[PDB]
């Protein structure tokens, strides 16, 4: 019945309020109109946040809270966990401090965020590897919470992959600042593609050590997850380019665009609740107190927010709460240390690229090389029998090198995809 949206100092308060008011008035008018209360507040302190949450809850029983932020602190989502557990109100996550998700969803929480989990990016990374035809893996990780299950999941995925990727043992960094065992650990890395399941601060040191060991050559490639490349405007001088990364930055979307999707999901959930039940949900008598026993006689909104479809965009969620069709665009560091969008993943959970990957020059050091020797071949004699590939979740037949060919669409158009 009531929707609360929290913003920051990034934009103007009045225009944000007007846009939030216009949001539900665009299309699909609800039978019960929902209002918006946008407050320009940058105080991410937990006490200020909980006091504001209490004031909003006391505000004629707000049934939906949209949480926004502009900083990089992940503790805002940590406090939001307890807020949702003790208030039982659906809350949607927007760009900001709560963008990164690393904690398992509590059973009593009603979280459905736009961020993608590590398991949800592993499939995208595997599709990127399929597209690049790189069949060698080298996972360099570090002892961090929750990474053991990620490693187990990626090992199960590569074992269940029909391509048959080479999977060397994962080299994990036992202790930081060893300066003695680090070289012994790094001596076991002999590959071309290296995955970095680490943090930004330790990844900087890992890449500096690789540069000292010369692991940033022409044949070497690196893949960066969303958490390491979260700060697009913080590019250290020790980061070599060519870092193919997947993220959901605001280069193709805006805060207004995301809150539009959030309010659409809220409208779909309200419609589902009205279809199933006929009683308007109510909050606790107090805003943050527990004088009475904490109970929720009404059924939770998790089953009602499964088949969420908005204007043909399937914004569905899994049982945990993670998205099924996230953004996860593909970015790569350019020659002059900039990130550009070179791929998307919203198309039926499939990864497509821009068919452009010439970044081979050494970035950490200065050493020109000539390895990729382009070869021109024509198919007119019984010496080349190149054919199509079998669509069986694999590149092609065994012991065969890949190639490419332009395909003409129309007699007038010269555009040709690099199949």
């Amino acid at each position: 019945l009531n929707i609360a949206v929290m913003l920051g100092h990034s934009h103007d308060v009045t225009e944000r309020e007007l846009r939030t008011l216009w949001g539900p008035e665009q299309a699909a008018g609800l039978p019960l109109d929902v209002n918006v209360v946008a407050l320009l507040m940058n105080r991410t302190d937990p006490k200020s946040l909980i006091t504001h949450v209490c004031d909003l809850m006391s505000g004629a029983r707000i049934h939906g809270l949209v949480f926004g932020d502009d900083t990089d602190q992940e503790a805002v989502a940590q406090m939001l966990d307890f807020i949702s557990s003790h208030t039982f109100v659906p809350i949607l996550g927007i760009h900001g401090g709560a963008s990164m998700i690393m904690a398992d969803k509590d059973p009593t929480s009603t979280f459905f965020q736009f961020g993608a989990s590590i398991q949800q990016q592993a499939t995208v990374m595997l599709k990127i590897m399929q597209d690049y035809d790189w069949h060698v893996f080298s996972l360099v990780t570090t002892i961090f919470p929750g990474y053991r299950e990620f490693i187990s999941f990626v090992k199960t995925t590569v074992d269940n992959s029909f391509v048959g990727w080479d999977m060397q043992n994962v080299i994990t960094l036992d202790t930081s600042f060893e300066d003695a065992k680090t070289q012994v650990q790094l001596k076991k890395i002999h590959s071309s593609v290296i995955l970095l399941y680490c943090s930004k601060d330790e990844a900087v040191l890992i890449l500096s050590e690789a540069r000292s060991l010369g692991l940033t050559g022409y044949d070497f490639f690196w893949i960066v997850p969303s958490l390491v490349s979260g700060n697009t405007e913080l590019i250290p001088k020790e980061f070599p380019s060519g870092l193919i990364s997947v993220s959901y930055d605001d280069w193709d979307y805006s805060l207004e665009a995301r809150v539009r999707d959030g309010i659409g999901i809220l409208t779909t959930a309200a419609s589902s609740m009205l279809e199933k039940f006929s009683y308007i949900p109510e909050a606790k008598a107090s805003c943050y107190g527990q004088m009475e026993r904490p109970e929720v006689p009404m059924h939770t909104l998790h089953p009602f927010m499964v088949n969420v479809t908005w204007d043909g965009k399937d914004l569905s969620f899994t049982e945990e709460g993670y998205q099924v069709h996230p953004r996860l665009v593909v970015i790569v560091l350019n020659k002059d240390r900039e990130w550009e969008k070179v791929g998307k993943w919203e198309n039926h959970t499939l990864s497509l690229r821009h068919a452009v990957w010439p970044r081979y020059k050494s970035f950490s050091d200065c050493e020109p090389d000539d390895n990729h020797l382009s070869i021109v071949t024509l198919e007119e004699a019984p010496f080349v029998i190149v054919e199509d590939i079998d669509p069986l979740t694999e590149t092609c037949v065994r012991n065969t090198v890949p190639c490419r060919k332009f395909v003409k669409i129309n007699n007038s158009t010269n555009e040709g995809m690099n199949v």
């Binding site: 006490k47 940590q78 406090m79 966990d81 398992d104 919470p145 187990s152 527990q290």
Partner: protein, 375 residues
């Protein structure tokens, strides 16, 4: 150089006894010159007032460590999530006493949470030691669909990968299920006859009652039961032949605090011997920055070793929890718990008492028979 270490204690009597303990420990070597000003917050079953009291009693002070105790009433769960959530903003290292939940094991859930009590997943080490000293090869696992159960299952699998073995079947429970006959029959129709139970107390009691009703308490069926699944109604509705587990001196809150306060007091001066530090904000609202000494606390605490504690050496693992905790293997004889095995670290010490088994067996059984029932 004035530090005001806060605390969150249960009752006023605890607030007095632990304040006296820390005052005594102030002069027990450790730091030098002046010492820390201690303060405490009483445990409250409410959230808003407890959070306000914590903010007005710790944040306003110069807190470098937080002492969080167990809820006064063991019947309720009352997980100390909010204190860790608040401390996550400034990477404040909290000190759990008896919080044995596996939610706090990984630091992804709680950014800065440290405790002197081993998690529920650490029972996997005890089970592996028992299997390796009693020659167990085939084992099935029965864990409920909870985060703690999943963590215990993952730890058990990872620790069992050393022997290159493989569990036969894994069965899942539900937080509130009552009819477990299907999974019980599935476990019965297996070569192994040893079952590991790790779930809530009520679910464990219900599944044990179902097993007793369906002839699963007979001879040749050894049961492995965790620490929290032997109390409550288990000791009332469970006959002999159960090998339980208990932590030695783990429930002594005063003994744990008498070591934790000394550890944190010494760590404060250890950090002071390092470069400059960052003070906590005075007002609870007015500073949204983050500490720069947060990782430094973890770095100086993981490698710290204290042999002056009551329970011996106090070492922290990669997750920041207790390492080499003193476990005690329990055994039920005529509805009486008898100490048999002593597990201080990576070693089990049997006692002179005979290890009884279900069905009145005085010898160790095994589930290595195929029963000649190969479909």
């Amino acid at each position: 150089k004035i530090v005001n270490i806060g605390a969150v204690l249960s009752t006023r009597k605890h607030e007095q006894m632990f304040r006296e303990a820390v005052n005594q420990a102030n002069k027990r070597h450790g730091s030098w010159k002046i010492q820390l000003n201690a303060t405490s917050v009483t445990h409250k079953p409410n959230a808003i007032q407890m959070a306000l009291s914590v903010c007005e009693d710790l944040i306003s002070s110069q807190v470098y460590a937080i002492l969080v105790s167990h809820p006064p009433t063991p019947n309720d769960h009352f997980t100390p999530t909010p204190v860790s959530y608040t401390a996550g903003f400034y990477r404040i290292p909290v000190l759990g006493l008896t919080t044995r939940m596996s939610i706090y094991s990984d630091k992804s859930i709680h950014l800065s949470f440290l405790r002197t009590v081993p998690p529920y997943s650490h029972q996997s080490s005890v089970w592996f030691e028992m299997m390796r000293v009693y020659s167990w090869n085939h084992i099935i696992l029965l864990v409920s669909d909870d985060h703690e159960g999943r963590a215990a299952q993952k730890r058990l699998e990872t620790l069992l990968e050393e022997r290159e073995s493989k569990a036969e079947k894994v069965l899942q429970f539900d937080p509130g299920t009552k009819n477990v006959t299907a999974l019980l029959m599935e476990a019965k129709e297996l070569e192994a006859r040893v079952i590991i139970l790790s779930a809530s107390e009520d679910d464990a009691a219900t599944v044990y009652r179902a097993a007793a009703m369906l002839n699963m308490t007979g001879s040749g069926y050894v049961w492995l039961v965790g620490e929290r699944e032997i109390s409550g109604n288990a000791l009332r509705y469970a006959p002999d032949g159960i090998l339980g587990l208990q932590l030695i001196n783990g429930k002594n809150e005063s003994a744990h605090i008498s070591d934790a306060v000394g550890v944190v007091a010494q760590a404060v001066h250890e950090l002071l011997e390092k470069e400059n530090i960052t003070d906590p904000p005075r007002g609870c609202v007015g500073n949204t920055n983050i500490w720069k000494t947060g990782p430094l606390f973890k770095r100086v605490l993981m490698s710290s070793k204290y042999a002056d504690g009551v329970t011996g050496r106090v070492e922290f693992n990669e997750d920041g929890d207790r390492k080499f905790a003193n476990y005690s293997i329990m055994n039920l004889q005529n509805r009486k718990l008898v100490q048999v095995g002593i597990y201080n670290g990576t070693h089990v010490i049997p006692n002179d008492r005979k290890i009884i088994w279900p069905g009145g067996e005085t010898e160790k059984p095994r589930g290595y028979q195929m029963s000649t029932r190969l479909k």
